[PDB]
Structures are given as C-alpha cells and as structure tokens.
Amino acid sequence: VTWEEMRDKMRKWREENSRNSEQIVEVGEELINEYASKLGDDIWIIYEQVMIAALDYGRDDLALFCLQELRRQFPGSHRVKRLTGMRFEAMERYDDAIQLYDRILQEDPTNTAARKRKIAIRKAQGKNVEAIRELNEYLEQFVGDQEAWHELAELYINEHDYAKAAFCLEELMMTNPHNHLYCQQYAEVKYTQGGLENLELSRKYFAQALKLNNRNMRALFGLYMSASHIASNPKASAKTKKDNMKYASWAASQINRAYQFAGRSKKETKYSLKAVEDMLE
Amino acid sequence: GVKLTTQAYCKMVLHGAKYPHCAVNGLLVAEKHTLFVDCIPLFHGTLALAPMLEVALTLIDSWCKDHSYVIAGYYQANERVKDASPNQVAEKVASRIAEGFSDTALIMVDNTKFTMDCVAPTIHVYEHHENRWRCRDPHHDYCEDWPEAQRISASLLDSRSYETLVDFDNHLDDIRNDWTNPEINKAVLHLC
C-alpha cells in the first residue's frame, strides 16, 4: 500500500466515471493529507474529483478547502468557475449558479461545461420538459457529444418517450459501433417500445451485443425472452415461429451452460439449478 | 393492512445507501395485514426498461414458489430529494403484481427522511382502491420492532455493509455475486 498504488487506483476510478463517492473521497483525502507533496501536479486533477465526491458524499468541510486551493492557484479559470458552480448547487443555491454560468458563457461562448451544468440545474429543479428542450437546443450546436446524447436518451427513457430514446441510442451506436453496452440498452429500449416490428430489431441487436461480447449474459437472456415473446405472439408467421423457437432453444442451451459455469465457479447450494428450473418452464 | 419485517427495513436502507445517487426498486416476498417475510432488490439508475423488470419478476416468482414464498409487494426509491409520488413504472408494476393478490400494496422509500439512524419511518405504503393508488396513514406503525430496526440499520450502515450488499443488477453483471444475499441475513441474525 504505497501512494503510487492509490494514485493508480484513483486514475483508474477517474478514467471510468465511477460514483462510489465514499471510497474515492477517502482515498483522495488520504492522498492530499499524507502524500500531497510526494508527487507533482498530478494531484490537481484529483482535487477536482475529491470535491465532487465531497458534494456527493455530503462532507462539505473539505469542499471549501479544495475550492479555495484551486481558486487561489487558478484565478479566472472556466473549469474552476464550473467547479464553484457545482459547489453552489450542492446547497440548491440556483440563482447565483445560473448567474455565474451566464457570466462564463458571455466570457466564452464555445464553453460546453456551462450549458451542461445549467441543464443539470434545470433537471434538478424537476422541470423535465424544459430540461429536454434545453438539451435539444444545445445539441443543435454540438451534434456529436456522446455524453449529452446518452444523457438525453436516459431522460427520454425516464419520461417514457421511447421513440426519441431509441433514435438517440441509434445515433449513439452510429458514433460508437464497438460498445456492446449501447447495443444492449438499445435492444432493451426497442423491446419496451412496441411489438413484433420492434421485437425483431430488439432480438437482432441483442444478438449483435452477444457477438460483440459473449459475457453480456444480461443481453443473452434478453434475447431469449424476446424470442419467447415473438413465439407467443399469434401474428408471428410459421417460418418466423420456427425461427424464433430455434433462437429460443439455442438461447436456453446457452443459459443452462452459463449457469453451469456459474455453478463450477462458486461452491454453494444450486440456485443456478433453480435458475434453469425457470428456463425449463 | 401492510406489515413488513425489520429485516425488510434494513434491506431498504442498505439498498438506498448502496446507490444513493440512483433511483432503485425491487420486490418483497411473503408466505401465503400480510407479513412481508423477506425482500429482494433489483437494478438501479434507469428503471423504465421493461425486459429487465420482466426477467426479474419471473426469477422472483420461480425462486419464491420453489421455497414456498410468494411475491407480495413492490418497493421503489426515487432519485430526487423533493420527489415522493410514484412514477409510471412503479404504478404499473404495482398494478401488475397486485393482480395476483389484492393484499399487495406499493411501498416507496421517502428519501427526504433518509438519515443515519432513520429516526422516522422512511417507507410510505400506498394502497390501490377505487382504481387509484393513494398513501396510507403516515402515523401508522410500519415496522414490527421500530427500535430494533433503528439499531440494526445504524449498525449495518456504520459497519460499511452497504458496499458488500448485492442486488439483482450485480447478479446480472456476474452470477458469482449472490443475488439471494444471505450475507446480510446472517449479519441481521448476528446483530439480533
């Protein structure tokens, strides 16, 4: 347990956007208290996460410390300005945060952080419709922002306009063909959206996600259940009926195999057997 | 007439603490004034997706009927602090689960009252009558042993047991994580 090890752990926990605020805030506090001078400016990015975790963790005592250090180091910085905006939003102080973001925008119009923070404020206030409208307007100038695209898709899913969410996930897959998570989420959204005309797309995209990653057993039994629903639908044609029955049988075989592997990996009561007891039904 | 065990409340607090930033949901199973003997969590964050909910409910029904329980309640904790009313997902899920047994009623973890010790009962129980869902009396007693629930929730949260808690979503990530989470059950037994 050396400061390099926790530094690498924090770097990994930053590269993939985790939100285990307690662990990251504890590690960051240890780093900035014990090994603050053991390494150079690489802690400064840490000083971002550490405060955000604090706002997530509720421990506001060190949020002021980190903010004051960053401000005294970086006067008139748009990143630190957004960070102050988040500090203000931590206590639902929305008017001052909005004014600060407007000042940032009038100082620099190409900044994208201020728009995202202001729409985060709007969605925190519960005005979902105006938040969706603001995101739609913001994308009209910044088509291609994958993060905002996925956030808009998630908001549409929450508000249950599954057509727009499916469209946004389609264009997200356009952006990133090789991410199986997007394919799985789009298959789920399409399955939830409607019937056979969308069930076919859902099962095709579930198969695509399985091809892109064999371990996504979530999408595995998602494909299984989509095929089963297609089978149970009277409108399915005879050739479609036998095709989806074959797909369901293959998926069931894969599910029994996967749960047998789950069995050999652990050592306990055979709940996985109970699990395939469900498949036999 | 909705009654849930103290372990159900501690599981509620555990799942709320595991993913504080994401809205969560799940089911509560009971044997055939109904007493919710046990509970089970499922997913977090995005909750409007159907396929996971369907596969979940099917697995809950299989596991419960294999071991004589039946699913009899639905819980959902929303993301927003100032939000305490059910959404479409919660309403439809509660209506569908209530189709089997009329005694099934919805419960929602009011995150506004979520504290370290859980001074006041966070859960609010909603009943379906006249084809409408409406809350019960807040002044009613909800847990079977309120001081016991308070102390066990405080001990579990202070023991950092929420990180070890596993819901259905982690089972989906990897089956090696036990979705039946008997670990919190043995911790409850040891604490009691």
């Binding site: 419709v129 409208r133 739609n136 307007e137 994308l139 009209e140 088509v143 808009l152 549409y156 508000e159 249950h160 306009d161 599954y162 057509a163 727009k164 469209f167 946004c168 264009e171 939830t192 959206q193 409607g194 089963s228 629903h229 149970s232 | 409007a48 997706l49 159907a50 909910l53 369907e54 409910l57 099917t58 029904d61 479409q88 997902v89 439809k92 899920v93 569908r96």
Partner: peptide
C-alpha cells in the same frame, strides 16, 4: 407470460435528427 409489463404509452422542440413520419424514400 405472467410478467409481461408494458412501459410505453404517453409520448408527452423535437430532438435534432428526429423525423416522426416514416418516409419510404430510397
């Protein structure tokens, strides 16, 4: 299926790139 819950229903400017009408142009 005893758990076939439907989550669709009410659909509420329009998101950029969206076009509701199913056009057969090819």
């Amino acid at each position: 299926f005893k758990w076939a819950i439907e989550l669709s229903g009410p659909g509420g400017l329009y998101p950029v790139g969206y076009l509701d009408k199913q056009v057969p142009d090819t």
